Symmetry: D3
Subunit: 317 residues, 6 copies
Amino acid sequence: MQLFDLSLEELKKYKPKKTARPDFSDFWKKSLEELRQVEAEPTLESYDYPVKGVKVYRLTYQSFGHSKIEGFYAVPDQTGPHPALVRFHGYNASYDGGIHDIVNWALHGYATFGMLVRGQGGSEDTSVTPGGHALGWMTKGILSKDTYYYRGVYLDAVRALEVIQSFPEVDEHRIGVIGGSQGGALAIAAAALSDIPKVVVADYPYLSNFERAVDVALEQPYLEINSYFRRNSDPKVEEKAFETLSYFDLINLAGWVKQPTLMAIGLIDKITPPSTVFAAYNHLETDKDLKVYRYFGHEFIPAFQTEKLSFLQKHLL
Amino acid sequence: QLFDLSLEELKKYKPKKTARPDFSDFWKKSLEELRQVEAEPTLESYDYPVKGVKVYRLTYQSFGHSKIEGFYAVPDQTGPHPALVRFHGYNASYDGGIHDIVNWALHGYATFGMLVRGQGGSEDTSVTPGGHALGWMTKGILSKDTYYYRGVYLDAVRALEVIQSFPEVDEHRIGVIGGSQGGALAIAAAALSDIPKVVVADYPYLSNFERAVDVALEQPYLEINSYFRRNSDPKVEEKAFETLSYFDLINLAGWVKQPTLMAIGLIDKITPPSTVFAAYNHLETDKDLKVYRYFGHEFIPAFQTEKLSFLQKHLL
Amino acid sequence: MQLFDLSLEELKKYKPKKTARPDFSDFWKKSLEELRQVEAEPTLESYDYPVKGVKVYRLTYQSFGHSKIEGFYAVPDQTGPHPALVRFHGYNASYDGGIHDIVNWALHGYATFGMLVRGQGGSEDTSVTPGGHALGWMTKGILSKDTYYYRGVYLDAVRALEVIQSFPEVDEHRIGVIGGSQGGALAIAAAALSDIPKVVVADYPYLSNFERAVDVALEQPYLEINSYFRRNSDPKVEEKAFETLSYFDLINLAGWVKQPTLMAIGLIDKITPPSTVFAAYNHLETDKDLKVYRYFGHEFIPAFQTEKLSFLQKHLL
Amino acid sequence: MQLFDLSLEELKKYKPKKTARPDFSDFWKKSLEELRQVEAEPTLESYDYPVKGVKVYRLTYQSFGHSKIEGFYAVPDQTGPHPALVRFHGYNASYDGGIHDIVNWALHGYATFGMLVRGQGGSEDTSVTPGGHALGWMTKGILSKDTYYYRGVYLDAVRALEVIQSFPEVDEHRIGVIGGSQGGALAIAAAALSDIPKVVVADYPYLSNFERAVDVALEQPYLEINSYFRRNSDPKVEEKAFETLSYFDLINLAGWVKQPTLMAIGLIDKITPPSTVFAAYNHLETDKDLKVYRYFGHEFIPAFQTEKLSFLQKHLLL
Amino acid sequence: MQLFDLSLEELKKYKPKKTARPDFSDFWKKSLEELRQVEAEPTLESYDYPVKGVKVYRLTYQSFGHSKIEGFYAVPDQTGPHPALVRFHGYNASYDGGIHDIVNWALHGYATFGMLVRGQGGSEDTSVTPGGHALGWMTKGILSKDTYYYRGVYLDAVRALEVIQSFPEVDEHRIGVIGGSQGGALAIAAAALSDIPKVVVADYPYLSNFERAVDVALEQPYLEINSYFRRNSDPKVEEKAFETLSYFDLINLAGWVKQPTLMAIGLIDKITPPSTVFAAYNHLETDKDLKVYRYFGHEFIPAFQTEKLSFLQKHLLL
Amino acid sequence: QLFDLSLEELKKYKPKKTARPDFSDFWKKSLEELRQVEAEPTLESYDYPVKGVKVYRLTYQSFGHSKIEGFYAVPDQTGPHPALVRFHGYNASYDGGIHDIVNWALHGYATFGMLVRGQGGSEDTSVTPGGHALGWMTKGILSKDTYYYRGVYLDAVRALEVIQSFPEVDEHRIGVIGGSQGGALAIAAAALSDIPKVVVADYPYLSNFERAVDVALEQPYLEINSYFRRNSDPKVEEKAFETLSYFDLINLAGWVKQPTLMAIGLIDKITPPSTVFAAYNHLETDKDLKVYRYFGHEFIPAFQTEKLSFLQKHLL
Ligand SMILES: O[C@@H]1[C@@H](O)[C@H](O)OC[C@H]1O
Ligand SMILES: O[C@@H]1[C@@H](O)[C@H](O)OC[C@H]1O
Ligand SMILES: O[C@@H]1[C@@H](O)[C@H](O)OC[C@H]1O
Ligand SMILES: [Cl-]
Ligand SMILES: [Cl-]
Ligand SMILES: [Cl-]
Ligand SMILES: [Cl-]
Ligand SMILES: [Cl-]
Ligand SMILES: [Cl-]
Ligand SMILES: [Cl-]
Ligand SMILES: [Cl-]
Ligand SMILES: [Cl-]
């Protein structure tokens, strides 16, 4: 592929005005309160996996809307407490719960839980579908911040941290949140809504600068929003949709992140355009660093893996 | 270009039903749960730049207490009028297909375009049991009780019950029509309800799943393939296909007693000819399948005439 | 896909200098005169169609070059006079004469005639092919305004209006011309050459700002011109071709339109680039309005249908 | 691209039943007669070209429907008579009259004329457009053999041979017709309608076995027919169309070819499917040979150029 | 994608006749002898990597043609001997030496060496380029088994095993060879030429049933061969090329494998078509098993990773 | 379609040279290593169905003792004849481009189509130091001494030395021509040898690398991008570009003193207009760049006339 978004020089300076409504923090305050009203009631069931030195489990817990969230949980097979990681998977990109990577994270020394995102890689989503929406999760319940798909997801992410930190074999002071694109977005959103995480690693975070994303993205899933408007021409629906999205946009959440953060971005990424990622990064006011990779897009970036491992090792291991 | 079975083979393609022993029992129970939900329909007039037709926004309660909607256009003249319940295609509803609904009314039919749950409109209260591929095709696929289309099919039946209750509607002249997903709902509705008089289905979807996933070259059948890629458990595949059989047209076709008109393009890559012939060949009723060599999953002009002529003859 | 032409802000101000030669109106004056010399001699043959309340016919008439033009003609089955519509189809986009849409227009209350464009959806084209040209109609007889394909077409469009208005069941004071792409172009061209039309509706009009179109378009049929030049490298051939096209370019004809006009444009339209459509719109000095649709391209735009029906209803019904 | 049509074993045996109507030869007899009624009145205008040893001209002549046909004509700059070639270009594939190739053919020793196909690479087409048709020339006037686009084209091809052979610097007994795709079809059609040509070279000939082509081709321009039917659903239109096409189908003309013929075909050709080309070849009853190239499609095949040059050299230059 | 090759029923029975020439084993006997003549002279240089419990090194050694082969070598940071793995990467698919995966393999308890294939993911290739060839490595030196690209590669693979087993911290009786596509092919080839490996894991092995692959494959890199023939039309070149390829074709090497073998194949794999993989599998006469995945292609198959980890654990780790 | 800098900008695009301080020293040493290899050319007649031309297989020894080949066609008449050394495009040589070589001879030019190492033919003895992206673009890219094109450029020069030594060849009327990669070799040959009288380069490749990798939308420039994806080490990228500068046309152009004719299509995605104008704008010699708005990386008929006319004027 090739360069397409703003020049690197412009990207570094790209910092769009926040779109957060006056009731932004109030919405998250209320949302967190509804989550708190749901007892976690976590369950742990051992799971066989052909690995030595790691114990794998299937973890489930109750979250927003009384939804049962799941994911594999791998723990180093040695005395703890262990530093932990809550890993979030990409949009519709979870295969068999990403169990093999979860196990490898545990082999690296981290008690790791790969929270499966509602209705995607796993987990239950009790939230009702208010009405029509484009193919996908991007616009489900988009006409209201209370019904929006990611409201439950973000909360599940926070609840995931609360459950993990409660584990006695987990060192609550050494918990990191990581993920790619959608996963990176959940990581950042979790760090913004909970102070449990110590550090944050986000690979080309998704759900960022929506109003620009729909005009710059050249591939799914941002375009699901575009597809949604094509099916609902009502001008008010568009205003409303973007109004809803602002409550979940990383450029509005970034400011709450106080944890050391490591981000990555490929300049030829057509799914999460550089501009939208730099936008999130430029709204972060915390110990941070953005690794830029000229020749990579929305994919695994080997050089960034080293960075990631090194960063987590330094702050947690 | 041509790709599925030859036309000669297609005419003879009739795969063994995959219906489980509790097939009709499942639908009997499902219809019963629907019956337990009062329709409580509502009608709100809706402005539209047309003369001779009155448009409304119709809503009603269905399975799972979901609120189903759709525009309802009625010829602006004394009834009773023959009616049509039109079903839209998969993720293919734009602005409720209001313009086509209105035109159907201009053709003389009191028409209701039922919006399919979470797609073109309507509420879907059914919970998402677990992970599934991007789309609706695999939502709740691990159980016939939780499967996406269970609610949809019931909404379709309820739509007919609501429409026929209207005094301006001639209950004896109600037809069900639709394209692909819409065609599948039409056929499924006729199989579960005797309210419809005739059925028109354009290259019906949700048919012969086990073959569709091996022949289709485009979405949305492949959503199932994507689902299995994400859940390699062999039991998950057995289960999924077990679930799908309760909604597969080749198992429902047999219950259709209404005159039925179908269409199929031989280069259709979304609803492969074989899967459509399969549904057609399982129908034991007054039927006819219009084959169009040079068309695919799209509007077929020649079939519109056929369609208008068929509906006119049985309803107008 | 995604945005690609000039920004919306720029589009609103895009008004390229007319390319009309000094003999512009003289060419059309002469052309109209040659048309006038051909007796219409229209014929009406009833045609069976499964519809109630509408009578369909096959209408044919003689036009420029003694070509026999055809098209279905649907009339509300009630006492007239009826408001009428001359509908023009898109480039190579006529299927079975667009009869189903013609009938629906009649059901909406309009005596409608879908003029089939020469050699495309129907009708005879007696104009000779002077020499080589690219695959398609875009460059047929392009080396001279007298031989150019659209000369006959535009005249057929005018003649269509003359024939329809002559019908006793047609209210000559309530005739509108409509069409999409090529059809929108014929609509606008007909209103510029004839004062018979009362109103004009054009969906992303084609044949506009050719010199820019060949540099911005990303799909057919504008690129047929590009293909033509690839096959005739002679620099003079290119000057000549554009010289010819200027006599049919909407930016040069728009100024003659005095009828209320309604236009539409999708910002991601790659066939008739937004710039070329805004160009035509910005050259119109009449009661006008351009509906912009951010998320649509060269296709049916539901929201615009309402606009269209509402516009025609207000001016004709 | 990859293999897709019938297996090579099947292709060699593929010989579809002729689709020629009972008035087939009568149609061509009448058609040739109408051509004969139009005086050629050829004209020759010298044309400058940066080459040594060759004289280039612009050649024009009157043909069917009084259409003015053109094309460059290159002649070796030495005393004749010279062996000649009438080269036909591919569908919508003529750039600047293919002048550079015409000149090279002359450098190879052949007085060469690249007849430009009506409305495509050049030449005038006076034939009227009866009615609607798909984008392209494939379906123009397809509802009647008298109005069909290629009627004039085929006749132009024959007239081209008559004009060329009349030239004193041309050895009428050493004239070959060559072409690729559409050009190969015109070559074969010209040899079938005129005995002027001595030999024939056709690269993956087009306009062959229409009824199958529309079901096997995966690219233009055969699919123009498919597009046409999509726009005219009337079943009678399809019967008529194929009726018309049969009068121009190579499988029905091949049998009249008596000249030595050399053909080529790439097995991954998606424009002129192998089956449709083998069909034309298998209907030829004359000194013939079909060069098969497994790894090539609808494109220039180097190995076949050698074959071609060698074949022409043997039958004409030699 | 979608199904396209032979049906599963046919695939299970697909076993093409070997194409090995009469001097097959003689060629490999001589080739191994030339390798033996090159002293390994391995070198080990520690390499920093952000991991705990594993020591990483850059390993290099001399192989066929005195080429210096490299790759990262990760070892569990605990007392050995350790079971080992020689991992081979896919065609042009090595990024930064696949170091992250090498380390993870070591975390699973395996002393792992990711041999970088000549000129691809790393390593030196001293073999000269005899002449023209298609873009890529597939046809380099294809006109002779002595000059063919993979001759050196296969030998590097065998040498890799010899070097690893010589390490004192490596349990020579618990060495496994694994790889995907090209990597799977090297794994199988190494087991066929060396008895050092105990078990073999090959994910949809490449370099198998060449003569069919070039007719079934729909993506690179098999088609490089097709591209090569397009550029060298000489019929003898094709005979020669396939003659050369037979000495490296898995269907001819499979028979020498005596080690327990685990293979995988996606039925919609367009790079290494199912038929070509079943062909290699059906030529294996040893403790074997082929995991078939209906919905996967040429990619990472999660279900097969479990199979793989479980298989290696059973035969090596525990 | 248009995509690079505007034509107005292209005419002014002249990027700073990237030549290292040892630029000419590298080429001086390189030419010296070539000189140390005796040409030892061989000529073997080759049958070809043509009249008036004699074809031969020509081979000679070059840098690294590599045996370079190519067909050589000579007008079958008394010489001396003007000559042409034709270079083929990247991976674009089929059967040695023999048919074109013959046609060039028919136009009156003793022509030799040098086959580029390992591509259209010829032997490449240069070792592969290490890993590199699929293709020749990055082979030995970590050092100017090992880089693929070092041998190629020298083979080009050696080709001229061999041809001019032929008695039937008029050493004062030798032109070098080629497209893209071939155009680049032509220009590089004219820069390193004064044997060529004139130069014709069709949209020359290997030009302004640092921009090419950011503007190109097709192969083979992107091979470099692929290389960096496989070797993330930042130093590897600095080194690679350091290597490439020794072969970049923007750094060699200045040495060209021969009349030069270039062509460029404005929609060329393989050799972007900017990279070609870059090479052109670095030429300080009798020159001319033919711009073709509607063409890309392909045969441009109009330019063929230009080309034939230019060569005729300077050589015939
Ligand atoms: O369904 C998957 C199962 O088959 C695999 O064994 O372990 C991971 C699960 O997600
Ligand atoms: O070049 C790579 C380096 O950047 C990475 O850090 O380690 C692996 C190497 O291959
Ligand atoms: O190998 C080729 C040969 O077969 C052909 O005849 O002439 C050109 C050569 O390159
Ligand atoms: Cl909603
Ligand atoms: Cl990407
Ligand atoms: Cl489920
Ligand atoms: Cl013209
Ligand atoms: Cl016709
Ligand atoms: Cl070789
Ligand atoms: Cl694949
Ligand atoms: Cl290197
Ligand atoms: Cl290009």
